[PDB]
Amino acid sequence: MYTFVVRDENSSVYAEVSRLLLATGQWKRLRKDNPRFNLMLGERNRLPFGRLGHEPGLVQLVNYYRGADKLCRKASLVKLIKTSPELSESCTWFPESYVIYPTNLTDEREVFLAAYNRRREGREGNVWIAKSSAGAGILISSEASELLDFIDEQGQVHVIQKYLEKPLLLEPGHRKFDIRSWVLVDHLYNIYLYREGVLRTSSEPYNSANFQDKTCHLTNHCIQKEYSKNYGRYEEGNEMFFEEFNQYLMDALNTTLENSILLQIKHIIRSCLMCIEPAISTKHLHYQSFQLFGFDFMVDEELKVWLIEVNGAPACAQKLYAELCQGIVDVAISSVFPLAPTSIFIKLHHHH
Amino acid sequence: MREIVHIQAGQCGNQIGAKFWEVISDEHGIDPTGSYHGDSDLQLERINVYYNEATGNKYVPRAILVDLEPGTMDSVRSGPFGQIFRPDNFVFGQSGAGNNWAKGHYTEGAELVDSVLDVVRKESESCDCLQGFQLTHSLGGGTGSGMGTLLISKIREEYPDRIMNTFSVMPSPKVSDTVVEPYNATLSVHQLVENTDETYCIDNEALYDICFRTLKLTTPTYGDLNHLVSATMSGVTTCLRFPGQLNADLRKLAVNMVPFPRLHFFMPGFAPLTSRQQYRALTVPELTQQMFDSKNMMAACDPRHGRYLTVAAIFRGRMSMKEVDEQMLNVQNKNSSYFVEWIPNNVKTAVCDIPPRGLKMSATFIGNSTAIQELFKRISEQFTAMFRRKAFLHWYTGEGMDEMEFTEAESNMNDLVSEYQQYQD
Amino acid sequence: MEVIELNKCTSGQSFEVILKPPSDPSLEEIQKKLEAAEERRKYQEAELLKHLAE
Amino acid sequence: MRECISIHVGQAGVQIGNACWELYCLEHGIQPDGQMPSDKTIGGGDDSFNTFFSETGAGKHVPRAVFVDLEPTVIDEVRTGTYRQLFHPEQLITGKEDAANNYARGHYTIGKEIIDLVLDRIRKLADQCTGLQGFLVFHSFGGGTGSGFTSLLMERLSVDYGKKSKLEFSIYPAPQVSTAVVEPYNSILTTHTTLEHSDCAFMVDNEAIYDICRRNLDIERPTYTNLNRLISQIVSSITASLRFDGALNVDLTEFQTNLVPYPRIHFPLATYAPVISAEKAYHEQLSVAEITNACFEPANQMVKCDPRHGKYMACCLLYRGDVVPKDVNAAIATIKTKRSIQFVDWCPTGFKVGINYQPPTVVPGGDLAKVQRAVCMLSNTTAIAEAWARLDHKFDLMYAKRAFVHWYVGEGMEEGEFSEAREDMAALEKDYEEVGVD
Ligand SMILES: Nc1nc2c(ncn2[C@@H]2O[C@H](COP(=O)(O)OP(=O)(O)OP(=O)(O)O)[C@@H](O)[C@H]2O)c(=O)[nH]1
Ligand SMILES: Nc1ncnc2c1ncn2[C@@H]1O[C@H](COP(=O)(O)OP(=O)(O)CP(=O)(O)O)[C@@H](O)[C@H]1O
Ligand SMILES: Nc1nc2c(ncn2[C@@H]2O[C@H](COP(=O)(O)OP(=O)(O)O)[C@@H](O)[C@H]2O)c(=O)[nH]1
Ligand SMILES: Cc1ncsc1C(=O)N1CCNC(=O)C1
Ligand SMILES: [Ca+2]
Ligand SMILES: [Ca+2]
Ligand SMILES: [Ca+2]
Ligand SMILES: [Mg+2]
Ligand SMILES: [Mg+2]
Ligand SMILES: [Mg+2]
């Protein structure tokens, strides 16, 4: 009879796991302050890792990798890619990005302006996007003056990265989109990719001449269901799954999702996770960790995959909550606490 | 040299105290004449905690026998180990107490208490360093209850910085001498709330049900009940009478068990408890499962109706101390809801290599549960059922008491119950 | 990876390696504390004896 | 040469002091009777070992130690043990009844009545000193004497020896060996009143020593002897520089200089390798790089935490045995490219290394296997603050209900000293965060 506790009531993913663990009749939930737990569905912010693994006779497991915020923060991811030899500054699957501190506070203001002027002079596409972790607040502009002035009006750190002016557009619709992949890392640091991704498509035709109306440029599910007038027109809730997106790629581009996109995605997932594996691995630690991640990719018209961001506390697609949550319990929880297929995951092998 | 002074008052107190000294006298190799005849030095390492050493290498229990009638103590002096007790430590009168608290506390007792304290003071003055006193007594009679709590009130006055522990037998209508036992118990419980650091609550009902249901005794006697108490009393004092990584006296044990000065009433427990299948080996998981089972509790309180403030287990015998740790952690982990989370690691465990007579291994349980309030509720209800009609009060008013003293003792105990209740939430 | 201040002797040696450069209460006040606590112990014990006398 | 006085307060401190002086004697070749053949200067001398030992005209080498316990059963073992001839009676002080795991009892009630006797016996050792450096105070956190009396002794030592340095070896409480529920109270009470009086403190978590004993030594249920022989190894590695010819950590002031740039944050983490069971058939002797790499595995630290997520302020490497600087640098470079070693921006990213060619001495019959080389790393990570958080958390759970507080007040302590000491820890936990997090 394993015991667990819940410290994140707002997590829909683990709300279903806590629901599934109980349904096994072998897991007993405790109060959120009882320290005699086998598993902790911990809180997002300021999770007390220091208080784990000090309970005699209890093997303790938490659903967050201490230090994984280095990869799940806008300003942290950029700093991690540029400064990590495994990723180097010449990383080819990540857009050119710069960390910009508002003037009311190192900072890459002059470094970003250097490359910007180079593009302005060389007649090249010079359209950037400014965003931050404090957003629901994004500004897509082609003038450097507007980008830097938009950040000074704020008080938090922001990042300016090259906006993909040539995004792959689904037809019919001539619309943008982004791909979401769920990756579960278990206590042994096996990288499991969920076979089921989701494309959060824009119902508005992409318009490269009007970055003011950000409804055809931002594929967020909340922006398309609030400021887009074609929501739910082409696909239910602006969400295309792999089966349809694959068939389309076959009919339109005469290729498969696995060959033209999935290989690049799996290569990006491995590169990022293996990079920080020494900094967050819980192999020789007094407690074990696992964590579910949500990778957001972009695909340009050349069928090249780009990494947008990594989500540390990602939510799932309404259809896949069942299959995925049962997968979290199978390989993450029951792998350490066994109960008395054809995996739904793609194990990305690697050297530990 | 950390001596304890033992005091046994009344019929219950002296009959149980006798069996207790009989049980540990055997464990320490002391024979009915006080001559050591053991085979281990562990038997004499802490022998001075309860025994004084006289000429000829004789060991005399540091015990003081008290009663207002000579009957019960005459038996003790004629019992198996009667000769082992210091003659000058038999202090008794002739009037008796008539199962009357007021006679033991105010009248008959008052006339005899000074003489008892003269023996107490005589036993203390010879202590290299007195840990404190322990009293065995019932709360339902007159001497053990009325005069016992009077002795406690005077021992605290003369030794205000010494630990006072008691083994208190609580009255149950199922094992009753007289109908005024709830009166005498309610009056004594208030004394114990004030003037004792630890009180081992021994409910005569629990001792009966165990003899009847578990031990399969068709008709239990006071002797059968006292056998359990003799074994449990020897179990808790094991760590005190034998060596080990414990290093614990009465004050250090009280500190780890009493989070609040008035909530010091403990539920005892013993394991094994077997009927005559009595030769079977008892495994460490079995000892632990039973020791936490309410059926092995001697306070007639369901622990699942409350929460443990603290717990202490004392295992005896040659066993896997690793397997002990694993099992103790198993009980807490598999039931952590029943242990207050605002006192971390409130379950402590001690081991002793010397097991009781004729027992490969055993476990003694000491629980500070808020479920003990159920015990004080029984007494409180039985009290009120009679006091509302002022029934049988004439026995007490005739000795100088006033109904107000009753109404206050009634309140004090109902307060005590409310105090347990607030910490159960 | 610079070694500095290397010292050697018969029973061992010691050095320093730099991988990168950078970027009370008086005796009086104690006696008072120890006596203030002994006074609260006497006051407490007096309230007990006063209680036991009543 | 300058002398160091060792003070062992409480059961933990005394039993650990006993294990250390046993080891000091094996290393320095001193017999249980105090005779040291290799010492050619009889009844005198200013050798490096004379910082811990004095001499008598009869060639006896007497530890500069003082054992203090409020109850005599533990110190009586010293009086009749194998090394009973090392100490003379004046050195062993014992009371009548202990503090019952009650800080206020050890600091106030019983502490007041014996402190002057202690300072007197300490003044007798100080008078045998031509240039006293300071004191090494071995004590537990959870014990009533260890915590309560030590903080009073520390307050008075800072008075009668205002210029001397004071280092602590402090036993952190671990439930797997503790029998006291109020140890969180005592630990925090003694950190509060001792913080400003201690210049460097080495915390040993009994939890850490317990697993290192079960994992590496294959002891199913380790006793205090197992835990102590291992702790006296780490203590020896730390005090070796004061007892042997060298140039790193040669006097007590050097520990503060090399390890504590900020005064309040004077709790360096200790990591020791290798720990090899003596019952092993025969172990493959580890290399300089192998044992040096293990200095960054949490399973060899004296306080379980994760330095990867803190920032270092200093770092020492104390090697013993067959080790040469070349091999040290090779392993260091290799570890910088494989380990997360973040320093504070206001401190250099470096390693002070010390090497003693004499390998670790192992108590005959003990549990540790003789190895050819060993190391002990003294790093000052913000990650050790995890131990304060754990402790502080437990304090808050009980004190919210005022649980057990009545025992302390009854001994003369005021309920406010609780919150006063708990606020200090709140400040201590903040500094660690100011220096460690971004
Ligand atoms: N590592 C180690 N810890 C010990 C040892 N002895 C006791 N402890 C720990 O010390 C704590 C209890 O403090 P003690 O030193 O025993 O108590 P004390 O200092 O003698 O103070 P008193 O309350 O007066 O007995 C517990 O956490 C024990 O686990 C020991 O020999 N080695
Ligand atoms: N460099 C870039 N080029 C093209 N599009 C970009 C881009 N950066 C962001 N976007 C657009 O923004 C959307 C996602 O923004 P982003 O993920 O940075 O904000 P966010 O983190 O608040 C949303 P979520 O965390 O849910 O994925 C995507 O749909 C993408 O089309
Ligand atoms: N367990 C046990 N209980 C007893 C014994 N004798 C009396 N009692 C209980 O104690 C109460 C009577 O008190 P008693 O000791 O006879 O009165 P006293 O002699 O004036 O102290 C009743 O509740 C009895 O059930 C005994 O030998 N063993
Ligand atoms: C509390 C107590 N009172 C009388 S005996 C006793 C006891 O045996 N123990 C076992 C050891 N550790 C404890 O904390 C208590
Ligand atoms: Ca008369
Ligand atoms: Ca000499
Ligand atoms: Ca000072
Ligand atoms: Mg986001
Ligand atoms: Mg009777
Ligand atoms: Mg002690």
XYZ file of N, CA, C and O in Angstrom, chain B residues 193-262:
280
model
N -3.579 14.518 37.533
C -3.355 15.517 36.492
C -2.382 16.584 36.968
O -1.635 17.158 36.166
N -2.361 16.857 38.271
C -1.532 17.917 38.828
C -0.151 17.436 39.254
O 0.839 18.144 39.037
N -0.058 16.252 39.861
C 1.112 15.895 40.656
C 1.834 14.647 40.155
O 2.639 14.073 40.895
N 1.583 14.208 38.923
C 2.353 13.114 38.345
C 2.843 13.491 36.956
O 2.165 14.201 36.207
N 4.031 12.990 36.621
C 4.637 13.201 35.313
C 4.202 12.150 34.300
O 4.006 12.470 33.123
N 4.043 10.900 34.732
C 3.559 9.827 33.875
C 2.649 8.912 34.676
O 2.971 8.542 35.809
N 1.516 8.543 34.080
C 0.539 7.670 34.719
C 0.166 6.551 33.758
O -0.425 6.802 32.703
N 0.504 5.324 34.131
C 0.210 4.138 33.334
C -1.230 3.716 33.612
O -1.513 3.069 34.623
N -2.149 4.077 32.717
C -3.575 3.822 32.922
C -3.886 2.358 32.643
O -3.818 1.907 31.495
N -4.253 1.624 33.686
C -4.524 0.195 33.596
C -6.008 0.009 33.880
O -6.440 0.057 35.036
N -6.801 -0.184 32.827
C -8.246 -0.326 32.978
C -8.579 -1.773 33.326
O -8.239 -2.693 32.573
N -9.249 -1.971 34.465
C -9.590 -3.324 34.893
C -10.504 -4.024 33.891
O -10.509 -5.257 33.817
N -11.281 -3.265 33.118
C -12.109 -3.882 32.088
C -11.244 -4.486 30.987
O -11.424 -5.650 30.609
N -10.294 -3.707 30.465
C -9.371 -4.234 29.466
C -8.659 -5.477 29.986
O -8.536 -6.480 29.273
N -8.181 -5.429 31.232
C -7.522 -6.593 31.813
C -8.462 -7.791 31.891
O -8.009 -8.941 31.828
N -9.768 -7.544 32.034
C -10.734 -8.637 32.077
C -10.982 -9.199 30.683
O -10.846 -10.408 30.457
N -11.337 -8.329 29.736
C -11.608 -8.779 28.374
C -10.434 -9.553 27.792
O -10.627 -10.526 27.055
N -9.207 -9.144 28.111
C -8.042 -9.872 27.618
C -7.994 -11.267 28.228
O -7.752 -12.258 27.531
N -8.223 -11.363 29.540
C -8.252 -12.672 30.188
C -9.382 -13.538 29.649
O -9.229 -14.759 29.530
N -10.520 -12.928 29.322
C -11.673 -13.698 28.875
C -11.563 -14.059 27.399
O -11.526 -15.243 27.040
N -11.508 -13.050 26.529
C -11.521 -13.307 25.092
C -10.185 -13.865 24.617
O -10.109 -14.995 24.123
N -9.112 -13.093 24.774
C -7.816 -13.509 24.248
C -7.274 -14.724 24.998
O -7.082 -15.796 24.412
N -7.018 -14.578 26.300
C -6.385 -15.655 27.057
C -7.311 -16.840 27.307
O -6.859 -17.848 27.864
N -8.586 -16.742 26.926
C -9.534 -17.853 27.027
C -9.634 -18.381 28.460
O -9.529 -19.583 28.715
N -9.842 -17.466 29.403
C -10.082 -17.816 30.798
C -11.573 -17.669 31.083
O -12.118 -16.562 31.006
N -12.227 -18.788 31.403
C -13.676 -18.773 31.575
C -14.093 -17.834 32.700
O -15.063 -17.079 32.562
N -13.372 -17.861 33.819
C -13.696 -17.035 34.981
C -12.427 -16.383 35.511
O -11.672 -17.011 36.274
N -12.156 -15.135 35.135
C -10.928 -14.474 35.593
C -11.011 -14.048 37.050
O -12.070 -13.676 37.560
N -9.863 -14.104 37.718
C -9.704 -13.648 39.091
C -8.832 -12.400 39.126
O -8.213 -12.012 38.130
N -8.782 -11.762 40.298
C -7.860 -10.644 40.468
C -6.420 -11.086 40.249
O -5.599 -10.302 39.762
N -6.096 -12.334 40.586
C -4.760 -12.832 40.312
C -4.459 -12.904 38.826
O -3.366 -12.542 38.385
N -5.427 -13.374 38.034
C -5.230 -13.439 36.590
C -5.002 -12.051 36.005
O -4.117 -11.862 35.162
N -5.795 -11.067 36.434
C -5.568 -9.698 35.985
C -4.194 -9.204 36.413
O -3.511 -8.510 35.651
N -3.762 -9.560 37.627
C -2.486 -9.059 38.126
C -1.307 -9.700 37.405
O -0.227 -9.103 37.338
N -1.484 -10.904 36.862
C -0.411 -11.508 36.081
C -0.075 -10.654 34.866
O 1.102 -10.435 34.556
N -1.099 -10.164 34.164
C -0.868 -9.234 33.066
C -0.114 -8.000 33.544
O 0.876 -7.585 32.932
N -0.570 -7.399 34.645
C 0.065 -6.184 35.148
C 1.508 -6.461 35.552
O 2.409 -5.656 35.281
N 1.753 -7.601 36.205
C 3.117 -7.965 36.582
C 4.021 -8.034 35.360
O 5.170 -7.576 35.396
N 3.515 -8.611 34.268
C 4.316 -8.747 33.058
C 4.512 -7.402 32.376
O 5.617 -7.088 31.918
N 3.450 -6.596 32.296
C 3.569 -5.281 31.676
C 4.467 -4.365 32.496
O 5.310 -3.654 31.939
N 4.301 -4.365 33.821
C 5.152 -3.537 34.668
C 6.619 -3.896 34.488
O 7.480 -3.010 34.421
N 6.923 -5.194 34.412
C 8.295 -5.614 34.155
C 8.751 -5.219 32.758
O 9.951 -5.040 32.529
N 7.814 -5.070 31.818
C 8.192 -4.725 30.458
C 8.638 -3.283 30.311
O 9.650 -3.002 29.662
N 7.898 -2.348 30.911
C 8.220 -0.933 30.747
C 9.487 -0.575 31.516
O 10.294 0.244 31.064
N 9.682 -1.174 32.684
C 10.871 -0.898 33.477
C 12.089 -1.690 33.014
O 13.140 -1.607 33.656
N 11.979 -2.444 31.915
C 13.127 -3.195 31.413
C 14.287 -2.265 31.079
O 15.415 -2.466 31.544
N 14.029 -1.241 30.262
C 15.096 -0.323 29.882
C 15.700 0.361 31.099
O 16.874 0.747 31.076
N 14.916 0.512 32.169
C 15.414 1.132 33.392
C 16.254 0.172 34.223
O 17.161 0.612 34.938
N 15.977 -1.129 34.143
C 16.630 -2.118 34.988
C 17.760 -2.859 34.290
O 18.482 -3.615 34.949
N 17.930 -2.668 32.991
C 18.972 -3.315 32.211
C 19.703 -2.281 31.373
O 19.202 -1.172 31.153
N 20.891 -2.612 30.892
C 21.684 -1.659 30.109
C 21.248 -1.645 28.647
O 20.342 -2.362 28.218
N 21.920 -0.810 27.876
C 21.589 -0.653 26.473
C 21.938 0.739 25.991
O 22.307 1.621 26.762
N 21.791 0.932 24.680
C 22.085 2.216 24.054
C 21.032 3.249 24.443
O 20.977 4.333 23.848
N 20.202 2.920 25.444
C 19.090 3.774 25.844
C 19.589 4.972 26.635
O 19.494 6.114 26.174
N 20.155 4.728 27.816
C 20.576 5.790 28.727
C 19.412 6.754 28.971
O 19.382 7.892 28.501
N 18.433 6.241 29.717
C 17.181 6.954 29.954
C 16.758 6.771 31.402
O 16.634 5.639 31.879
N 16.536 7.885 32.095
C 15.963 7.889 33.428
C 14.508 8.354 33.338
O 13.961 8.552 32.249
N 13.867 8.538 34.494
C 12.449 8.886 34.493
C 12.211 10.270 33.900
O 11.198 10.495 33.227
N 13.127 11.213 34.134
C 12.924 12.563 33.616
C 13.136 12.618 32.108
O 12.390 13.300 31.396
N 14.146 11.910 31.600
C 14.381 11.914 30.160
C 13.278 11.167 29.422
O 12.878 11.565 28.321
N 12.768 10.083 30.014
C 11.643 9.380 29.408
C 10.394 10.252 29.400
O 9.635 10.251 28.423
N 10.166 11.018 30.468
C 8.992 11.883 30.504
C 9.084 12.979 29.453
O 8.074 13.350 28.844
N 10.288 13.505 29.222
C 10.451 14.608 28.279
C 10.053 14.180 26.873
O 9.439 14.950 26.125
N 10.391 12.948 26.490
C 10.102 12.470 25.144
C 8.651 12.053 24.955
O 8.234 11.834 23.813
N 7.873 11.945 26.034
C 6.525 11.401 25.966
C 5.422 12.390 26.313
O 4.283 12.183 25.885
N 5.715 13.446 27.065
C 4.670 14.327 27.575
C 4.741 15.679 26.875
O 5.423 16.590 27.364
N 4.050 15.862 25.745
C 4.070 17.175 25.082
C 3.426 18.274 25.903
O 3.734 19.453 25.684
N 2.542 17.931 26.837
C 1.838 18.922 27.628
C 1.687 18.389 29.043
O 1.467 17.185 29.231
N 1.812 19.251 30.053
C 1.981 18.741 31.424
C 0.804 17.923 31.932
O 1.001 17.047 32.783
N -0.409 18.164 31.436
C -1.579 17.437 31.917
C -1.915 16.205 31.087
O -2.705 15.371 31.541
